[PDB]
Structure 1
Amino acid sequence: SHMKSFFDKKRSERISNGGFRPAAPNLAGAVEFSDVKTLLKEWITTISDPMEEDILQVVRYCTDLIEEKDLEKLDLVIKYMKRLMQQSVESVWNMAFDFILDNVQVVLQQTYGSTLKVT
């Protein structure tokens, strides 16, 4: 973990699971969409310059949702980030959303490479 990572700090404020990797898709230990939504809003509204490692933790959470076949939650999370990041007055948040979406769509397309043809 890193001192300056928003999501590492949030995970350390939650009660510790013992220090083990969770199997469940999670963002800083949060699993319920209501808890994930709260963390995402706090991140985007309190951090004006998001850290690379935090952006990658969001990508990894989304790719974990894909691997869990939880596309319903993936859609909710992507739409919520789209709303908050694309409306930001900070250009870096729009760039972060583009990066997250691009990486998630590559993972989705490859995971379903035998099923889906991207137009």
Structure 2
Amino acid sequence: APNLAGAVEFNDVKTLLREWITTISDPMEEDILQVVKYCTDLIEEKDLEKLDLVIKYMKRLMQQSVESVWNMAFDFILDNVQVVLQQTYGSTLKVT
């Protein structure tokens, strides 16, 4: 059910992320928020495997960038994800 800009299938969601992350340079806050919404929806829809894989995939791409804007975009995303997991599942995603 959860989707990112219309993309539902994992593969579509991922390719959407790579395209965005590797070609924008100045990501819009609206798109960053859309990603946060998608991740929290995954938590609500009980699909933690997808949440883990996506956080891991964004982390790889947003940190492997010298562009600090992506470094900060990721911290913000993970941050709001963790706050929601802590209240819903009682734990925080292990990320390393």
Describe the superposition over 1:92-111 as per-residue Cα deviations: whole angstroms up to 9, x where unpaired: 00000000000000011111
Unaligned runs of at least 5 residues, structure 1: 1-23
For residue 113 of structure 1, report the CA deviation from its aligned partner.
3.7
Identify if the C-alpha distance between structure 1 residues 47 and 115 changes in structure 2 by more than 3 Å, giving closer, same or farther: closer
Does residue 68 of the first structure (1) align with residue 38 of the second (2)?
A: no
RMSD: 2.9
From the CA coordinates, give the structure whose radius of gyration is larger. 1
More helix by share: 2
Structure 2-normalised TM-score? Answer: 0.91
Q: What SS is found at the alignment partner of 2:17?
A: helix
Aligned residue pairs, count? 96
Aligned counterparts, 1:39-78, within 5 A = 39-78=16-55
Q: What SS is found at the alignment partner of 2:94?
A: strand
Structure 1-normalised TM-score? Answer: 0.74
Cα distance in 1 for partners of 2:95, 2:61 equals 26
For residue 32 of structure 1, report the CA deviation from its aligned partner.
1.0
Describe the superposition over 1:48-81 as per-residue Cα deviations: whole angstroms up to 9, x where unpaired: 0111110000000000000001000000100000
